[PDB]
């Protein structure tokens, strides 16, 4: 039988005889579009990093916010369908704040990641017998870089399908497959913070169409002491020229 | 609410091999004494009883569902004659949390519920709850004037936790039956009648 994918494709709630339903597997293909992202974790500091897809020379590129704050000790990224993000994160923070009421403490990081993943699952029944709120499972594949006392510095990969993972060095989006092999072979368990910011500003170079500058990229780094901050342009340009001064020698 | 057909007191006590509880058989309308054929004791299984006071309109409402509770236990558990049956703690919490969720709704049941029986291991059980849902336990209990008159008495037989296995059945039945005498001697609404229930962790149960 050859008409297994041709007909069982479009309705969400149709098992195909191979066991699988497709309209979720296509949602996974969405975030393969968009602009890439990286997350590296450390005993000393978590770090992210993105491109920006310079589209026109007159836009004000502080606006498209592939990276956000979500709480004082958590921060996100996303390499997917845009508008379906701002329906996500205005829930995800809302738990962390709500949690600061019902329990008066900086929430853990995974529980937040479990509240999201119990939201995209609303093309169906959620955990507590809920019914439905949508029919368009959406591509906003996240990276939740955070800190909490039990287990230190973490990141995750939260996908629409619900299931997630505690990756240590991830890279999602269009430049993944060329990267996630490159980060496969250059992740010790004993790196620094700044032995990573330069790294993630080397893979990003080779993988992206244009050349690398401050304008077409940025990054962030939380810390248990300072918090989520999105670095500055002239600060980033410090690291870029620093790299070249390391390459030639 | 405010009741009309209100019952009267009951009595309990624990002992070495089991417990004893009993009531009288009476239905009031005020000072009048209309009905005297009723009971106050609704057995459940072969280990457990429940005494009732208060509004007899509601005592009919308790017995209607306890018989159904055990019934809906038997559904799909062939094992549930021997060990997966209704011991009392499987019950009393149903007659407790019903009530707190029936008080806060503000249409309560003006009964005063006593429960007696034995677990499967063999140990004593006894507990109590009024309409407001409060709960407690001790080796001997009563209701209404029975607790203002006869509870002090029976505690002379059973002071506290120590002297429980310093006791037997023949001495036990021969105390409350003398407390029965008091209420028929002085209590306003009592009646000469009686209705007894004993339990034994070995011989089981019997009745009036």
């Amino acid at each position: 039988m050859f008409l297994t994918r041709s007909e069982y494709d479009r309705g969400v709630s149709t098992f195909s005889p191979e066991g699988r339903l497709f309209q979720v597997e296509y949602s996974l293909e969405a975030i393969k579009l968009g602009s890439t992202a990286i997350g590296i974790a450390t005993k000393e500091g978590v770090v992210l990093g993105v491109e920006k897809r310079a589209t026109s020379p007159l836009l004000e590129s502080d606006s498209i916010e592939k990276i956000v704050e979500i709480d004082r000790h958590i921060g996100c990224a996303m390499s997917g369908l845009t508008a379906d993000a701002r329906s996500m994160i205005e829930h995800a923070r809302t738990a962390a704040v709500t949690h600061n009421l019902y329990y008066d403490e900086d929430i853990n990081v995974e529980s937040l990641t479990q509240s999201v993943c119990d939201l995209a699952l609303r093309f169906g029944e959620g955990a507590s017998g809920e019914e439905r709120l949508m029919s368009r499972p959406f591509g906003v594949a996240l990276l939740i870089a955070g800190h909490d006392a039990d287990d230190g510095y973490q990141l995750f990969h939260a996908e629409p399908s619900g299931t997630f993972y505690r990756y240590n060095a991830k890279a999602i989006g269009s430049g993944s497959e060329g990267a996630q092999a490159e980060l496969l072979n250059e992740w010790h368990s004993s790196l620094t913070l700044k032995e990573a910011e330069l790294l993630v500003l080397k893979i990003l170079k080779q993988v992206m169409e244009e050349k690398l500058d401050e304008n077409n990229a940025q990054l962030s780094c939380i810390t248990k002491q300072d918090g989520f901050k999105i670095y500055d342009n002239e600060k980033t340009a410090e690291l870029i020229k620093e790299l070249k001064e390391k390459e030639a020698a | 609410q405010q009741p009309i057909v209100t019952g009267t007191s009951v009595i309990s006590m624990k002992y070495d091999n089991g417990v004893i509880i009993a009531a009288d058989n009476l239905g009031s309308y005020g000072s009048l004494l209309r009905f005297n054929g009723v009971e106050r004791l609704i057995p459940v299984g072969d280990n457990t009883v429940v005494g009732i006071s208060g509004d007899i309109s509601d005592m009919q409402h308790i017995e209607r569902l306890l018989k159904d509770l055990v019934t809906e236990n038997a559904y799909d558990n062939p094992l549930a004659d021997a060990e997966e049956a209704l011991e009392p703690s499987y019950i009393f919490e149903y007659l407790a949390t019903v009530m707190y969720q029936r008080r806060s709704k503000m249409n309560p049941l003006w009964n005063a519920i006593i429960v007696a029986g034995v677990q499967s291991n063999g140990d004593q059980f006894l507990r109590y709850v009024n309409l407001l849902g409060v709960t407690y336990s001790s080796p001997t209990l009563a209701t209404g004037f029975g607790a203002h008159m006869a509870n002090p008495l029976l505690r002379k037989v059973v002071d506290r936790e120590s002297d429980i296995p310093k006791t037997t059945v023949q001495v036990a039945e021969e105390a409350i039956v003398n407390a029965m005498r008091v209420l028929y001697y002085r209590d306003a609404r009592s009646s000469r009648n009686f209705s007894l229930a004993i339990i034994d962790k070995n011989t089981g149960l019997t009745f009036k």
Partner: protein, 101 residues
């Protein structure tokens, strides 16, 4: 009609410097009537916490039973996290403030 009355009790509990305790009576009374002689009032609520409800009895137990049940949902969700006291400072602010009227 009156939905709640009185049952008695009188409690107290102290912190040291590297310890603490909690004390509570062990009698229940209706209206100068010994309703019972020994019925406890104070419970290890898991994660080495002790609490007590002195006053009306039923409410003083149903409140607890929601706290013994909140504490475990805190473990099932958040992966066996030990629940500090600061949490229960304002968690219990909510269980009660859900009944202000």
């Amino acid at each position: 009609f009156n939905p709640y009355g009185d049952n008695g009790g009188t409690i107290l509990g102290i912190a040291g410097e590297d310890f603490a305790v909690l004390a509570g009576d062990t009698r229940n009374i209706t209206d100068y009537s010994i309703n019972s002689r020994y019925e406890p009032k104070v419970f290890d609520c898991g994660d080495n916490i002790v609490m007590s409800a002195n006053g009306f009895a039923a409410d003083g137990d149903a409140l607890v039973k929601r706290f013994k049940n909140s504490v475990k949902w805190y473990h099932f969700d958040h992966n066996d996290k030990k629940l500090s006291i600061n949490s229960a400072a304002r968690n219990i602010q909510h269980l009660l403030y859900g009944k202000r009227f």
